């Protein structure tokens, strides 16, 4: 085993998490999880492979088949991975979260024999334990967590961060039977810690991702072109996605800083496409480079040399959903400052978001556009815009939808809580104090067939309005 490559990267406002959905816990701090990098690499590899296999053959393969194919580099239950990931960072020493003291002996007395809610809130750098039963108390505390006002108002202004905070700030407490004080101290300190750790949100997180290669898995039949496709998908991932949660909304976005390689015979073109991003002049140049690298997979002097194997399996479009890149819905815009961008992305994906009530300007139509794209919505007509066989005014026709009759795609689009957002957003930079939002829309294998540049009009109206 020896080093394959090493990618000095950088994450922008990442929201990681382990065993407690925060990036910090009483025992260690973990900003970048190599497990998440591996998983997102594999997911982007499947997306990219379906992109290629649908361009060149108009066919789509199940995820199980694709990673069964890539077993010889990514590994499975039958074979150990050949790529060993790493994540190194500054301050990789002891950096846990300690809550030295918290003065809450009073709110306890306010919670005697009362069935009452206890909400938390930062109120002008002072946190308040707002008891819903008409009470507020300025709790005091000390912690090695130095939360700056920048982070506090980043969470307050971003209407999506303030939404995923509804589950780290509030505890219902029933002391009506009886309640000791030493037990409410424990409950409230748990609440305080779950709230405080939510604000460990760093920025400019910079980490060196190493890749080691199992030499013993040398070229058996197609190891080399598989591994090369895998490195290309690693590039695609680093360029379109991010680590952590809410990467479909800009957070955790990644940015190349330096890519030193150590085996050119595997990595030459990869390092080249990487170093092309070390400095980007302006918007459309970056757009051109994104397109050049998206289609270097499809139409350059090498595209594939292994799809001619029958390990794969075609999707059953009545059963399966698969994502893939369209390589034409990739509007880019420069932003000049990143926090307000993230604060505004909520306007671009909210039903009553003032940046969408301007682009579509219709009820029951924004709703359909946001139920089809934009991840799982909570639906309370509209499906008339979501049929398979019915009036196509705005083409949001799902493959196997049928009126007043549920099928697999029907439940999946309306009631399936874990459904990524096709409309995604990326914030990149190139070490020269310039940054370009990248908006795009992955193509799902449940869209019958969409009107591409109509949705592209929508997308560019978004990326121009969302700034």
């Amino acid at each position: 085993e020896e080093l394959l490559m090493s990618l000095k990267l950088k994450a922008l406002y990442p929201l990681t998490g382990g065993y407690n959905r925060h990036s910090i816990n009483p025992f260690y701090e973990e900003l970048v999880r190599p497990t998440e990098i591996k998983g997102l690499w594999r997911w982007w590899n499947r997306v990219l492979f379906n992109t290629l296999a649908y361009s060149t053959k108009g066919k789509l393969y199940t995820y199980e088949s694709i990673d069964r194919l890539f077993e010889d580099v990514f590994g499975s239950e039958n074979k150990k991975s050949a790529v060993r990931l790493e994540v190194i960072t500054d301050e990789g020493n002891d950096n846990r979260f300690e809550l030295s003291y918290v003065e809450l002996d009073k709110v306890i007395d306010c919670l005697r024999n009362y069935k009452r809610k206890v909400s938390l809130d930062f109120i002008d750098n002072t946190l308040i334990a707002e008891i819903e039963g008409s009470t507020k108390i300025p709790i005091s505390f000390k912690s090695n967590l130095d939360i700056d006002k920048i982070i506090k108002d980043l969470v307050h202004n971003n209407k999506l961060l303030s939404f995923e905070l509804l589950g780290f700030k509030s505890v219902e407490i029933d002391a009506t039977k009886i309640s000791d004080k030493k037990i409410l101290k424990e409950i409230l300190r748990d609440l305080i810690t779950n709230y405080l750790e939510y604000f460990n949100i760093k920025q400019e997180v910079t980490f060196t991702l190493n890749i080691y290669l199992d030499k013993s898995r040398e070229h058996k039949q197609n190891f080399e072109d598989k591994l090369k496709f895998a490195l290309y998908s690693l590039l695609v991932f680093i360029l379109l996605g991010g680590i952590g949660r809410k990467t479909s909304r800009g957070f955790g976005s990644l940015s190349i800083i330096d890519v030193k390689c150590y085996d050119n015979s595997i990595c030459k073109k990869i390092e080249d496409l990487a170093k092309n991003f070390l400095k980007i002049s302006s918007g459309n140049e970056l757009k051109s480079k994104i397109e050049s690298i998206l289609d270097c997979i499809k139409n350059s002097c090498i595209d594939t040399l292994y799809i001619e194997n029958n390990i794969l399996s075609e999707i059953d479009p009545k059963k399966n959903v698969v994502y893939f890149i369209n390589s034409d819905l990739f509007e880019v815009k420069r932003i000049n400052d990143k926090e307000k961008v993230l604060a505004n992305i909520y306007k671009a994906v909210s039903s009553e978001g003032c940046c969408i009530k301007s682009i579509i300007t219709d009820k029951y139509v924004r709703k359909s556009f946001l139920i089809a794209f934009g991840g799982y919505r909570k639906v309370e007509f509209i499906k008339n815009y979501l049929c398979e066989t019915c009036e196509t005014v705005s083409s949001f026709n799902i493959v196997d939808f049928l009126l007043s009759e549920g099928s697999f795609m029907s439940d999946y689009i309306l009631q399936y809580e874990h459904r990524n957002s096709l409309l995604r957003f990326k914030l990149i930079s190139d070490n020269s104090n310039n940054s370009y939002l990248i908006g795009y829309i992955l193509h799902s294998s449940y869209f019958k067939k969409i009107d591409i540049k109509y949705v592209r009009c929508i997308l560019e109206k978004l990326t121009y309005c969302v700034i």
Binding site: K106, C110, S134, T135, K136, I137
Partner: protein, 173 residues
């Protein structure tokens, strides 16, 4: 410049004659909108001097009382014993906010001085005794709210949830 007026809501029988703002000017910050009761004010840290119902300043961050908010100065022959103050009109610790604020108002508080005569013992006594929930229909909102009993059929809710909505701390001297 513009004013408001906090009207107590204890269980006592002392609502009809303490003020002279039966209409306000033309509005009501606290208003019912057939969903329930909305936008009532909580003043914590101040216990109730029950007789001549007014709030005594306490240091306890845990002593709270509930009431409505309107605009005025009471009785036209008062404000020699109150606490009137002007504020950003957002330091209001309101609940059930189903309205709006003029971004700036002044508030008179019905205030009773401490009168340090002994150790104090405030007592949480949630409002009850539905004879009181009916005389706070008679004496309170049949007069303060010329909209009460004349617009909604939903008086039963604005009489039954009152048990939950309001409370106070009686010191009981």
């Amino acid at each position: 410049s513009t004013q408001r007026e906090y009207v107590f809501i204890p269980i006592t029988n002392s609502i009809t004659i303490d003020v002279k703002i039966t209409i306000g000017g033309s509005d009501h910050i606290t208003n019912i909108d057939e969903r329930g009761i909305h936008n009532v004010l909580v003043i914590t840290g101040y216990a109730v001097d029950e007789k001549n119902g007014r709030l005594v300043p306490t240091l306890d961050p845990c002593d709270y009382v509930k009431g409505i908010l309107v605009a005025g100065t009471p009785q036209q022959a008062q404000s020699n014993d109150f606490l009137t103050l002007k504020l950003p009109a957002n330091k209001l610790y309101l609940i059930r906010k189903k309205g709006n604020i003029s971004d700036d108002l002044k508030i008179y508080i019905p205030y009773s001085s401490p009168d340090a005569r002994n150790s104090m013992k405030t007592k949480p006594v949630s409002i009850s005794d539905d004879t009181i929930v009916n005389n706070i229909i008679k004496e309170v909102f049949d007069k303060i709210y010329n909209i009460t009993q004349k617009e909604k059929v939903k008086i039963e809710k604005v009489k039954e949830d009152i048990k939950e909505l309001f409370s106070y701390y009686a010191l009981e001297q």
